[PDB]
């Protein structure tokens, strides 16, 4: 049954692409009379490209199974050999077998091993193999009736001679599926295995965002493994034997898929995986209207696409936060990264720059390609005062790389649209040093100013760090807020940390006294005396000159 | 002899994950037919060197009774044209043909250099052959592949896909309990003195990982050998039984070995251990106590912080007139405080190339947070922390990018477990306002001129190792100097 | 020797290293001296070539792995220790790094006595003054 | 404005070469204020780059004869800070001072592919907004 695989019912989420491939491969191979009647000669080569795991090899198995026509598998790196001049003979005999036996189908996987573009290559055997393949493919008459199936992971590293008319005329961009396609594929893979009743695959498809083809299969497998793991502990399932009664009592529930989702990530973003930071929207005290506006602006393209279509306003993808230090811009970014239900790639500003020539722009292009692959995504740019510096900030030149990287960022952000769904969040401390080219409309439209907290916002912030902290019943925080005027969230954090340190010192002193003399903890809660001792040394961070500069900038906008 | 699952302690979670993947589909396959789907078959172990990944591979090879193949990374390649791919095919064919088997690919970084930045055709052909073998037409039939790496980011993304390498296990630095299991594993097959106390020793180790612990044990043993082979003669021929027996390893041996050995990761930036003590610093008693408590509280009492559920303060910046004793405090912290010390000068990290300053800063902070808890000393912080935009003529804002890298890297979307930054500057006006922000450098300590009793304390500290006249008194000297500093 | 292993053919340097180590283990309990290791260890991360990475990986595997080292001791010499891959400066590969630094007055006198032994000195020659006035000589 | 020295002026040189190659053409210089600046006006600059940019622009515009019939179009918000060396006769002498009907046409062209309410007139927005612009 495994060798049988599955025909059209295996591959899902790409109706148009599969229909096109079947049209090209079956009709001119079963009955070529209709193509002669209409008067078009069907092509002899078809290219497939796209990200890995989209289903190309699956496409090859489906065409091999659905059509009973003879097949002959060859692969790129297994054609050449050690003896002098046998790759050409190998390809020649391959084509001879393809012609002599029947109107067969030939499938070459990973052409990149054979087409190095003829520009980044120095040896001669590759030239021989490329020219041999070119002449063998070109020298195919109408009566040959043999088709080749090509499978490349990256299409731009192809010898352009193969893109010429008459060679591999039909390309097919097998892209990422949509919500319906992803749900369909989930159904396809999970139908053999048992599934518990309490399951809503619609939610799983609305939450599955960057996964493509195989990653969802990984999700399913991981959930199943989790189910197997939880049932082994509780029943004391011993490795020595298996109880049949346990076997029939096996069902993967929705919680398994939730756990798998919490542990799995899209394959494309696997390299750029970030450490997990647990921030919630109630943890970010204050900034209520700003938080509501950001979440609403990010939620509309992902929840009401019909509403987005039924309109004409261009969705402004970018946004830039600016304000004084320690107000919570990075905290808002953390909260978005944790609790938005979408992809997120965090980058620090200067990391991308490299000493070598070209690598920097290569990094910008590959990162934005990863952003495009795992659509939707949220690319968080830290400290644009390192990338988007004013071309004239410094008279001295650092090699001209700064202009090149800035131009690379503009060309890769101006080459966007509604598709691929990528919202770029900016966050800078000094708004004067960013290039105005970036703040042009259509590139970075929204400009949110994160001001110093007010009395209610400050009280909310103070309550936000004391959520998990055990606290003495007799404490009132309104006085603390009223007494602080120019403080920031960082100052409040410093106050709370000082209070915690004083409490810990008292606890350790009391424990040492107890051990010397010999409730367990004399200080289970923080005290007003501790708060008084912390605010005896507390003080504000941002100066009045900085406040003046930010107010002047705000009024200028 | 054989290294089983009881010699690979300290990675219980990952050990269980890999034991499950290797055993459950090879002990009770019926369960995987009952659930309906096939099990995972590709797993990638990654982590810093010496954490025990190769040890884990050895344990799996020793325990499982199935067929096992071992492949060193570069060994597969050969001189004859198209011989590497033939070797890969032969290896996979042998693995499949004989029985269900475990392949082990050691040092995968040598084989998959992303197939995009490389320019050799042989590399691209070996990568394509591996990709085809591990996933493709007739890819695998009940054989699992494990690979080991130190730099998972240097691997081609196509290899990091489900079906080829589905799960990546993170073999990271062990915790204190992990160090305890490692010590018990390595100190169970030796003769030790009764005085030995392994728990305190594991507690006092702060960044040592695996082979580091083994090195510590070896050093202790070697010192014991160099403690009892001195009383006995050279004995070129043979050793008497009375010394061969009753050797014993005292705890002092372990303390001595701890005073020399250092984490393998931080061996790059080891600093010579200058000898200072708390009594060497005259005056500044309250600053001494505040610094001592602010450093030792997170590292000795973590339960109380989790009881209150709040993170500690990290940064501190000394500022004051030159020579008040800031570098002396830094030296004392470096020499006696238990946390690791990375002493770096101000302008040391700058470089003429483009971006190498920020790369070096990132490397330094990565090492600092790797062997946490760690203390980082930034001497003359005003050299690296300049007021952004103050200089019209600059090397394309090299200082601006450096300060931005420092700010974002020391506080961003990181883990921020235990890194304590110490700053020492005598001109605090040149510092950027963001650096002074709480949560980056929360404690701004001013070191004023010494008072009369503090000048007396300094004089006593500086005369602590010199013979003096019995009739000499230092109170007059203190009464006479009023504007002096420690240097004077 | 350090650069002695490199060859033009693809896949021959690491083969030479393998042959060296296998011969060393096949012959007797041996000692392996690698001089000027800075040419076979450029940290494998800042370098951009390909053969250097392969030799570094081969050396790392040979140093430690499966059936790592049966009665063989490895000695290395370098002029700058910071420019070597951290994976080599670990226990099991290079357990201990000895710092052979500048000798002192007594060391300088010892070196002078060692070298002047084969030469014919006069009866008026003293070596203490020479070792005193000699300050920064590396031997 | 290229960071590399010399390249900055070479950009304007090959821009005017591309202009003179495809004759006739229109070179719309947006935001003239920057390029049209007094030579060495700012004491602090990147080695007086402004002066070299203005000199390249002046010496690559004054060399235009009756042949090649190029035409430079400028636009600015602040006309105070433009260089009188670029407002000279023989290079660029015209001064067009620059409505309600254009605002109504802009509002009607922006609302083409938009489901507007039928009971709505845009003449009120045209009459209320006087000194506005198309971006706002």
């Amino acid at each position: 049954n495994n060798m049988n695989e599955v025909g059209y019912d295996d591959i899902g989420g790409c109706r148009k692409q599969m229909a096109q491939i079947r049209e090209m491969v079956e009709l001119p191979l079963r009955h070529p009379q209709l193509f002669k009647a209409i008067g078009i000669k069907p092509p002899r080569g078809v290219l497939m490209y796209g990200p890995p795991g989209t289903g190309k090899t699956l496409m090859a198995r489906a065409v091999a199974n659905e059509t009973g026509a003879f097949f002959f598998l060859i692969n790129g790196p297994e054609v050449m050999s050690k003896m002098a001049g046998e790759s050409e003979s190998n390809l020649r005999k391959a084509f001879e077998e393809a012609e002599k036996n029947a109107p067969a189908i030939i499938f070459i996987d990973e052409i990149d091993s054979i087409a190095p573009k003829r520009d980044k290559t120095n040896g001669e055997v590759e030239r021989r193999v490329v020219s041999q393949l070119l002449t063998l493919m070109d020298g195919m008459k109408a009566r040959s009736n043999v088709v080749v199936i090509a499978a490349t992971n990256r299409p731009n590293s192809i010898d352009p001679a193969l893109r010429r008319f008459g060679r591999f005329d039909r390309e097919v961009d097998i892209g990422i599926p949509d919500a319906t396609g992803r749900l369909e594929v989930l159904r396809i893979h999970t139908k053999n295995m048992k599934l518990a009743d309490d399951v809503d695959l619609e939610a799983l498809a609305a939450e599955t965002h960057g996964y493509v083809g195989a990653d969802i299969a990984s999700l399913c497998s991981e959930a199943a493994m989790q189910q197997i793991r939880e049932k082994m502990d509780l029943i004391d399932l011993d490795e020595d034997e298996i109880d049949a009664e346990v076997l029939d009592s096996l069902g993967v529930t929705m919680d398994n898929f939730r756990f798998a989702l919490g542990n799995s990530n899209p394959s494309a973003l696997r390299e750029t995986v970030v450490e997990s930071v647990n921030v919630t929207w109630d943890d970010v005290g204050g900034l209520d209207e700003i938080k509501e506006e950001l979440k609403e602006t990010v939620e509309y393209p992902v929840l009401h696409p019909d509403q987005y279509t039924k309109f004409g306003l261009s969705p402004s993808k970018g946004v830039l936060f600016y304000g004084p230090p320690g107000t919570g811009k990075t905290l808002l970014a953390k909260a978005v990264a944790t609790e938005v239900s979408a992809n997120f790639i965090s980058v620090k500003g200067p990391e991308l720059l490299s000493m070598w020539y070209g690598e920097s722009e290569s990094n910008i292009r590959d990162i934005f390609d990863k952003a495009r692959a795992a659509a939707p995504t949220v690319v968080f740019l830290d400290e644009l005062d390192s990338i988007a510096k004013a071309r004239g900030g410094s008279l001295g030149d650092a090699g001209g790389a700064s202009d090149r990287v800035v131009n690379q960022l503009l060309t890769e952000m101006d080459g966007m649209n509604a598709k691929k769904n990528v919202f770029v969040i900016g966050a800078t401390n000094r708004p004067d040093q960013i290039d105005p080219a970036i703040l042009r409309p259509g590139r970075l439209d929204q400009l949110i100013y994160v001001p110093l907290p007010d009395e209610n916002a400050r009280l909310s912030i103070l309550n936000a760090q004391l959520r998990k902290t055990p606290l003495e019943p007799g404490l009132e925080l309104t006085a603390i807020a009223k007494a602080t005027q120019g403080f920031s969230g960082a100052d409040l954090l410093y106050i709370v940390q000082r209070a915690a340190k004083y409490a810990i010192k008292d606890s350790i002193e009391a424990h040492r006294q107890h051990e010397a003399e010999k409730e367990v903890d004399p200080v289970p809660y923080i005290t007003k005396e501790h708060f008084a001792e912390a605010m005896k040394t507390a003080k504000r961070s941002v100066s009045d000159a900085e406040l003046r500069r930010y107010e002047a900038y705000s009024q200028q906008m | 002899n054989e290294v089983g699952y009881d010699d690979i302690g300290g990675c219980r979670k990952q050990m269980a994950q890999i034991r499950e993947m290797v055993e459950l589909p090879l002990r009770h396959p019926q369960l995987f037919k009952a659930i309906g789907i096939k099990p995972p078959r590709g797993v990638l172990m990654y982590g810093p060197p010496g954490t025990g990944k190769t040890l884990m591979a050895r344990a799996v090879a020793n325990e499982t009774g199935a067929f096992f193949f071992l492949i060193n990374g570069p060994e597969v390649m050969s001189k004859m044209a198209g011989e590497s791919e033939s070797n890969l095919r032969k290896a996979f064919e042998e693995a499949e043909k004989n029985a269900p088997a475990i392949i082990f690919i050691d040092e995968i970084d040598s084989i998959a250099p992303k197939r995009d930045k490389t320019n050799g055709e042989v590399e691209r052909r070996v990568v394509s052959q591996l990709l085809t073998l591990m996933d493709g037409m007739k890819a695998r039939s009940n054989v699992v592949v494990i690979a080991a790496t130190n730099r998972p980011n240097s691997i081609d993304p196509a290899l990091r896909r489900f079906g080829r390498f589905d799960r990546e296990v993170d073999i990271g630095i062990p915790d204190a309990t992990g160090r305890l299991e490692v010590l018990r594993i390595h100190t169970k097959n030796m003769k030790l003195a009764d005085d030995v106390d392994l728990e305190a020793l594991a507690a006092e180790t702060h960044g040592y990982v695996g082979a580091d612990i083994a090195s510590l044990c070896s050093e202790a043993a070697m010192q014991q050998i160099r403690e009892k082979m001195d009383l006995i003669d050279l004995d070129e021929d043979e050793i008497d039984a009375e010394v061969l027996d009753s050797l014993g390893v005292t705890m002092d041996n372990f303390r001595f070995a701890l005073g020399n050995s250092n984490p393998s990761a931080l061996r790059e930036t080891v600093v010579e251990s200058v000898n200072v003590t708390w009594d060497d610093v005259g005056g500044l008693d309250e600053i001494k106590e505040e610094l001592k408590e602010t450093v030792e509280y997170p590292v000795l009492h973590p339960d109380q912080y989790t009881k209150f559920g709040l993170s500690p303060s990290k940064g501190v910046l000394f500022y004051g007139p030159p020579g008040t004793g800031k570098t002396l405090l830094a030296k004392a912290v470096a020499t006696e405080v238990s946390a690791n010390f990375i002493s770096v000068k101000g302008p040391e990290l700058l470089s003429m190339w483009y971006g190498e300053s920020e790369s070096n800063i990132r490397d330094i902070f990565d090492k600092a947070r790797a062997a946490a808890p760690t203390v980082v000393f930034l001497d003359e912080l005003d050299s690296i922390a300049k007021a952004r935009g103050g200089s019209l003529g600059d090397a394309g804002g090299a200082s601006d990018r450096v300060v931005n890298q420092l700010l974002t890297e020391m506080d961003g979307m990181n883990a921020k477990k235990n890194v304590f930054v110490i700053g020492a500057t005598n001109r605090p006006d040149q510092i950027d306002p963001a650096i002074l922000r709480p949560g980056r450098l929360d404690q701004l300590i001013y070191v004023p001129l010494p008072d009369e009793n503090a000048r007396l304390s300094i004089l006593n500290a500086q005369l602590r190792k010199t013979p003096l006249e019995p009739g000499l008194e230092l109170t007059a000297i203190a009464k006479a100097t009023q504007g002096f500093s420690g240097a004077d | 020797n350090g650069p002695e292993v490199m060859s033009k053919m693809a896949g021959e340097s690491e083969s030479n290293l393998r042959k060296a180590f296998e011969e060393a283990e096949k012959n007797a309990p041996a000692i392996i001296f690698i001089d000027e290791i800075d040419s076979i260890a450029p940290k494998r991360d800042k370098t951009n070539g390909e053969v250097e990475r392969r030799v570094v990986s081969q050396l790392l595997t040979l140093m430690d792995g499966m059936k790592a080292r049966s009665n063989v001791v490895v000695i290395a010499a370098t002029n700058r220790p910071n420019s070597i891959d951290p994976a080599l400066r670990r226990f099991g590969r290079f357990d201990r790094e000895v710092d052979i630094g500048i000798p002192d007055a007594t060391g300088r006198l010892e070196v002078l006595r060692i070298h002047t032994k084969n030469m014919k000195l006069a009866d008026d020659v003293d070596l203490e003054a020479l070792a005193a006035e000699t300050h920064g000589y590396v031997g | 404005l290229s960071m590399w020295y010399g390249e900055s002026e070479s950009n304007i040189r090959d821009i005017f070469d591309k202009a003179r190659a495809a004759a006739p053409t229109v070179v719309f210089l947006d935001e003239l204020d920057s390029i049209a600046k007094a030579r060495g006006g700012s004491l602090g600059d990147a080695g007086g780059a402004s002066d070299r940019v203005v000199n390249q622009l002046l010496t690559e515009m004054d060399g235009m004869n009756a042949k090649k019939n190029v035409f430079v179009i400028g636009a600015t918000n602040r006309p105070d800070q433009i260089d009188p060396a670029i407002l000279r006769p023989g290079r660029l002498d015209q001064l067009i001072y620059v409505d309600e009907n254009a605002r109504l046409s802009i509002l009607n062209a922006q609302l083409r592919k938009t489901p507007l309410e039928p009971g709505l007139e845009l003449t009120a927005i045209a009459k209320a907004t006087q000194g506005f612009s198309g971006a706002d």
């Binding site: 000493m355 070598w356 | 019209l392 | 053969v51 | -």
Partner: peptide, 22 residues
């Protein structure tokens, strides 16, 4: 029989210079 060969020649780097104003 044929044979292969490895080759890694060099690359190109970028330097940073400092200027003085007056």
């Amino acid at each position: 029989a044929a044979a292969a060969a490895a080759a890694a020649a060099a690359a190109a780097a970028v330097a940073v210079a400092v200027a003085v104003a007056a």
